[PDB]
Design a protein around this nucleic acid. Sequence first.
RNA 1: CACGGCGCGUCGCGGCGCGCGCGAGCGAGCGCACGGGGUCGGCGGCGAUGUCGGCUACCCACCCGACCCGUCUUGAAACACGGACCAAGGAGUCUAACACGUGCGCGAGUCGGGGGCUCGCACGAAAGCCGCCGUGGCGCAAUGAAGGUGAAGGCCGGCGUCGCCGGCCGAGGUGGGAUCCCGAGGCCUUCCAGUCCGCCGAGGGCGCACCACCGGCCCGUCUCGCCCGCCGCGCCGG
RNA 2: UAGUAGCUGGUUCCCUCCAAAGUUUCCCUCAGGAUAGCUGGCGCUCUCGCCCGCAGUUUUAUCCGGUAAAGCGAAU
RNA 3: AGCCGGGCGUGGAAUGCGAGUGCCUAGUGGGCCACUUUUGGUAAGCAGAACUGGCGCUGCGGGAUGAACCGAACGCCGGGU
RNA 4: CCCAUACCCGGCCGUCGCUGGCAGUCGGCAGAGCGAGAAAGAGAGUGGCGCGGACGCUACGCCGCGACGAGUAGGAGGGCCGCUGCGGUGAGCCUUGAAGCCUAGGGCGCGG
RNA 5: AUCUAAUUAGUGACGCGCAUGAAUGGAUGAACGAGAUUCCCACUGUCCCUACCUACUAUCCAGCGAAACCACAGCCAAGG
RNA 6: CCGUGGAGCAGAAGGGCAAAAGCUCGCUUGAUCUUGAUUUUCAGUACGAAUACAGACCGUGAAAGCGGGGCCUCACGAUC
RNA 7: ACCCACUAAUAGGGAACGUGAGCUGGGUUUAGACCGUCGUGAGACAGGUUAGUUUUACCCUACUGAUGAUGUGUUGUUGC
Lengths: 105, 159, 187, 147
Amino acid sequence: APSRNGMILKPHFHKDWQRRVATWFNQPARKIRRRKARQARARRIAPRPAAGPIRPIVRCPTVRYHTKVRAGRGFSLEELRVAGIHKKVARTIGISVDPRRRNKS
Amino acid sequence: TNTKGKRRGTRYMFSRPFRKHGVVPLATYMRIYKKGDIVDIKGMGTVQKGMPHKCYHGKTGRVYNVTQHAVGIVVNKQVKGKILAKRINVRIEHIKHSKSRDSFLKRVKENDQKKKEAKEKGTWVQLKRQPAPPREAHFVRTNGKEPELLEPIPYEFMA
Amino acid sequence: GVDIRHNKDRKVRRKEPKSQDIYLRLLVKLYRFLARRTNSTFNQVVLKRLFMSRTNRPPLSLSRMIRKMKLPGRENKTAVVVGTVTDDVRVQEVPKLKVCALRVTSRARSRILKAGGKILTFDQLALDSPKGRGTVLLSGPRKGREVYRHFGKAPGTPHSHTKPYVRSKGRKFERARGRRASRGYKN
Amino acid sequence: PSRLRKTRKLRGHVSHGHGRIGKHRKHPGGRGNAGGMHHHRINFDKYHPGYFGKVGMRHYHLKRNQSFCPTVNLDKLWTLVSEQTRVNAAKNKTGAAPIIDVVRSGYYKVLGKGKLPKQPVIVKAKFFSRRAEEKIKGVGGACVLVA
RNA sequence: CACGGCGCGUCGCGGCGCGCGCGAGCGAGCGCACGGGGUCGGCGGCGAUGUCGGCUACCCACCCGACCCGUCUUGAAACACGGACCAAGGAGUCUAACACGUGCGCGAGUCGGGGGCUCGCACGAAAGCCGCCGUGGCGCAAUGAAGGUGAAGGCCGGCGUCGCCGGCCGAGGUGGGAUCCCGAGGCCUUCCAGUCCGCCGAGGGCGCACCACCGGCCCGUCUCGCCCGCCGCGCCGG
RNA sequence: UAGUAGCUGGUUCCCUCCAAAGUUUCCCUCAGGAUAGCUGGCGCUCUCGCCCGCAGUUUUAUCCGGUAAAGCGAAU
RNA sequence: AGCCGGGCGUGGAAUGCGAGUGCCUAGUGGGCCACUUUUGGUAAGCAGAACUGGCGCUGCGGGAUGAACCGAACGCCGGGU
RNA sequence: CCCAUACCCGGCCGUCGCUGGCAGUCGGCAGAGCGAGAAAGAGAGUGGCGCGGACGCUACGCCGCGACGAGUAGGAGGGCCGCUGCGGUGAGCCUUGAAGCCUAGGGCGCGG
RNA sequence: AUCUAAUUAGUGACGCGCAUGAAUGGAUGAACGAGAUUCCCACUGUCCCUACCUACUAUCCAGCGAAACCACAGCCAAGG
RNA sequence: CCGUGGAGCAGAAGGGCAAAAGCUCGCUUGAUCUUGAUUUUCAGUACGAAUACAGACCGUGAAAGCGGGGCCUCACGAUC
RNA sequence: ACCCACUAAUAGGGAACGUGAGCUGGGUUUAGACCGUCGUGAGACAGGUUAGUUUUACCCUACUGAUGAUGUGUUGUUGC
Ligand SMILES: [Mg+2]
Ligand SMILES: [Mg+2]
Ligand SMILES: [Mg+2]
Ligand SMILES: [Mg+2]
Ligand SMILES: [Mg+2]
Ligand SMILES: [Mg+2]
Ligand SMILES: [Mg+2]
Ligand SMILES: [Mg+2]
Ligand SMILES: [Mg+2]
Ligand SMILES: [Mg+2]
Ligand SMILES: [Mg+2]
Ligand SMILES: [Mg+2]
Ligand SMILES: [Mg+2]
Ligand SMILES: [Mg+2]
Ligand SMILES: [Mg+2]
Ligand SMILES: [Mg+2]
Ligand SMILES: [Mg+2]
Ligand SMILES: [Mg+2]
Ligand SMILES: [Mg+2]
Ligand SMILES: [Mg+2]
Ligand SMILES: [Mg+2]
Ligand SMILES: [Mg+2]
Ligand SMILES: [Mg+2]
Ligand SMILES: [Mg+2]
Ligand SMILES: [Mg+2]
Ligand SMILES: [Mg+2]
Ligand SMILES: [Mg+2]
Ligand SMILES: [Mg+2]
Ligand SMILES: [Mg+2]
Ligand SMILES: [Mg+2]
Ligand SMILES: [Mg+2]
Ligand SMILES: [Mg+2]
Ligand SMILES: [Mg+2]
Ligand SMILES: [Mg+2]
Ligand SMILES: [Mg+2]
Ligand SMILES: [Mg+2]
Ligand SMILES: [Mg+2]
Ligand SMILES: [Mg+2]
Ligand SMILES: [Mg+2]
Ligand SMILES: [Mg+2]
Ligand SMILES: [Mg+2]
């Protein structure tokens, strides 16, 4: 029942929410495991960059962010061809390549 | 329970006095009310336009707005445990200047005048209205006639 | 038996700060002594305001301080505020002021020192002027908090411009029945 | 902490601060927001007017990004650039005016609220308001639109 | 008789009142007490195996008082209900949301909660750091259903019967307002000239926060009416 | 599934201070709620050691009324 | 009618008393009794109202006994009335 | 003439108020006051032997005056009241005897 | 009307039937009924009006041994 | 000729009304468009009803004026 | 309530409308049935009819009886 004055609230606890609860007590262990895997892969690929393949310059696709510049999924075939890089050799020498991206500009 | 009609129980309050029905005298219409006069409320049943509610009958308020035919007045109403100063619009028939304020105004003028006077004279004069003081000592002169006896009369039935 | 009422027998005002830090309590000791052994009431006011809570010591802005000290007659006097002096960015010219406050924002302090004024703390204020002559006692806007927009005469009631408690602002949240003559009634 | 709570002080009082006449029962008035129009109507009307009913048009696939348009005011307009910029423009004698780009700092529309210091400015933005435009013109300066 | 010096005594009404000087407003001791709450600088007995002290607590006697608790109830000792007795257990907790009050840090900003860097690892699953990891949240702008719009102005010189450019000044006004400023006068002693410093104080200022009221500005809507702009002079825009 | 219960029963230490209501309005409302009222807590703005206000009171003025009483040689 | 400026304090009845203001808020929403006024009822320790005070929430002296009557309201004690 | 927890006088506890007082413990480097009906300086200046003196002040402390003290439902404050575990600390205690339990013993606190 | 000294009972008639009635069956009826009623004969302790006798208990003892229930408990009159 | 209302004013009752609020004629559609304020029940919330205004278009009258329904007190309805 | 008979008279009442751990259970008042009236129906009837489990005392007191206690030194007899 409403008290004197306050906000109308709609708590979404009308289901059996107590059976599906995600506690985060394994967060530090997860961070430690991810780190260990990261360093293990970095050691595995001996001289190669730890981050991975280089990626391209892209513009965010929205009025809210079109002023910013991201890191894209991969270089497209038009760019590879005009840069003189074969689409199959780029991946094995360290260039991320995707064929979906176009080039309007 | 009772009825919530606007004129319930007003058959004597809004009625006209004995042998005073008919045309409203024009002096009531020919009075001037300005902003801020203290004024009395007395509902008159002869005219039904702008009749005040029965709970303001006999109440005294202050004029705050003057209009073609009516006057807006601020009057206090006791509602349960609190008093609200609420403003109502009453047509000019049901209204009448309060004489409770003019006495104080005349007193103000008069004691201001007697304060301005005697200021050069340097004498002392009383302005505050003191309460009725106890009677002072005096002499009661008998003129040679002695006071007459008073005795209770004997009981004897009338009816 | 005595015909009296004990409802309002006990007054509620603060006797000492609710805070537990030691610097404010030392200031309170000093100004307690000053107030009880000096006839000046400036010390009493300052000590009372030291007792007060955070929401009763609203911050004072640089623009407010310069505006209130630019008034005629109060030149080269020390502006005393028991709250926090925060910087105002929408003011370019800042004169030289002699400020005293419990704490001052870093940017505000930089601005005043660059302009050429000096910052005082209530201790040194005691040394400079124990009775506090040549002081302009200011305070921030106490009604500045947004909680005061929800107070007073209740909403949904004629001639009440009181902010309701709504979880989100939009066209679907408290706009239909009591707010329109088209749907029910308009207060 | 449980040490400081009201329950500790309430031990020994049978009632537990809930009354003897009217007990502490489960849900005397109904659960949640029940009876908003029937037996809590007075409270709902007194404290949340406009709660019931519909108004306005429905927009199905709303995308906030289309309507994203942050605003800035003229009193804050000079804070976008460094102070050294403003003072250099102030004591400059060639009449050159600094360029302030609010889109670079993340603002799209310039609204004219505050007083503007008397020095020329080249304000470039995406949207302007009439009063902001007239303030800039009066102080001496230029308004530039970008897309 | 709570009268007591000498003067100059009009400081005066006829002397009394009542003023001006008299090393300049300094006589000292002892003592008694109906005097800002009790002292005695007064005494007397009984003390080693039968006596001294021990409020309370152990038992007993007497006088007065005294109905069994808890609970619902207008009303409980009730011919209302629960209760043979004892031990242990036994009931406003935790999460989320919101509101308000309080304490702390920073402050027009604030916050790493997610991730990452730190030789992973007793504590340590902690702690530190990131700053071109503040994405992002809340706040800094509101209003309108929406298209959308989006938060002062006040004075002089240039054509009052100014079109209209400059010179400026700058974010109102009234009332009440804690504090502060000023300050007519006023705060002592041989006199007299004459200061310094500090306190007092008529009136008068500047007026915080806050309240009330009057204006002003922004958005929607209504009424009235005229003017202005052009890349496209229009069912245009202001 | 520890189903719901506006309905019974119970609801665990001490001292100190303050201290009620069974009334208004709405509800398929009448063994219950919401809302005013009554309570407490937290404060804050000033005040005195010329003056401000306030009052379950009186006084002086000034209005308001149709009960007790009375009347039917006055209206009904 | 609103604005400005100026002049008037013997603070213009008695009595008493510091006042104003803002948040958050529990319990309550079964009542009962008495003088007086009063409706229904033959009447009732009945049913229903108005004012005030009580009981409920309250012990104490008295009415032998007693929720309400008369007196008087309460920290632990000594004396007096 | 008798007596209530009423009234008067006195003692003690507590609460509230005075938003009362005290940093002045200013000592042979000193001079012991700010109770006294009257808003404010024991004001500063310039000319005509014996080496001595109690307590205090955990200022969250100490001290002084007045008034007051019923209480269910309920609200608030203080507990050097109590139980269990954790971080500190007591150069803590303890087989020359800890915890627990029993007691016609001695005491403290209004009470826990 | 009969039954009895006496009959709210029973049986036989009367029918204006609160509200009888025809396979929601009406009327009758031999035989039958641990079915429901009234009267008569016989018989009797049902009664007038109680008494006596027998067996097993109850009673006391040896052995063995619970349960219900229990605020505290247990003499009355009146008052409130 | 007398006639203070002893009639009538739609309805219950009460109040009010005489060159009128009654009766008879003439002309009309203020029963129209629009923003606010206030009163009545009241929590001082809605609905309903009502009161003074203000801004346009009108009606009527020679005009002053009066009129945004019925002389007043009742004749009515949220969200979706 | 009425009647028959006797009698001296066949007066009226209370005690939780005395008295169910005293009886009985004929009546009311469960569940089975039947009829009449009512209801579309399940069903209803202060209408009629028929059949329908009546539990426990060993506690306290009261009461009826039975030992005994109490003082006179112990006992006994006779007594008031
Ligand atoms: Mg509640
Ligand atoms: Mg007392
Ligand atoms: Mg209080
Ligand atoms: Mg309690
Ligand atoms: Mg409740
Ligand atoms: Mg609850
Ligand atoms: Mg006795
Ligand atoms: Mg009970
Ligand atoms: Mg009660
Ligand atoms: Mg019983
Ligand atoms: Mg019960
Ligand atoms: Mg029992
Ligand atoms: Mg236990
Ligand atoms: Mg709340
Ligand atoms: Mg449960
Ligand atoms: Mg119920
Ligand atoms: Mg109940
Ligand atoms: Mg009457
Ligand atoms: Mg009469
Ligand atoms: Mg109840
Ligand atoms: Mg009654
Ligand atoms: Mg009371
Ligand atoms: Mg009492
Ligand atoms: Mg008696
Ligand atoms: Mg005594
Ligand atoms: Mg005393
Ligand atoms: Mg008490
Ligand atoms: Mg023992
Ligand atoms: Mg027979
Ligand atoms: Mg027959
Ligand atoms: Mg038939
Ligand atoms: Mg047939
Ligand atoms: Mg049949
Ligand atoms: Mg045996
Ligand atoms: Mg006419
Ligand atoms: Mg008009
Ligand atoms: Mg008409
Ligand atoms: Mg019996
Ligand atoms: Mg039977
Ligand atoms: Mg049956
Ligand atoms: Mg036996």
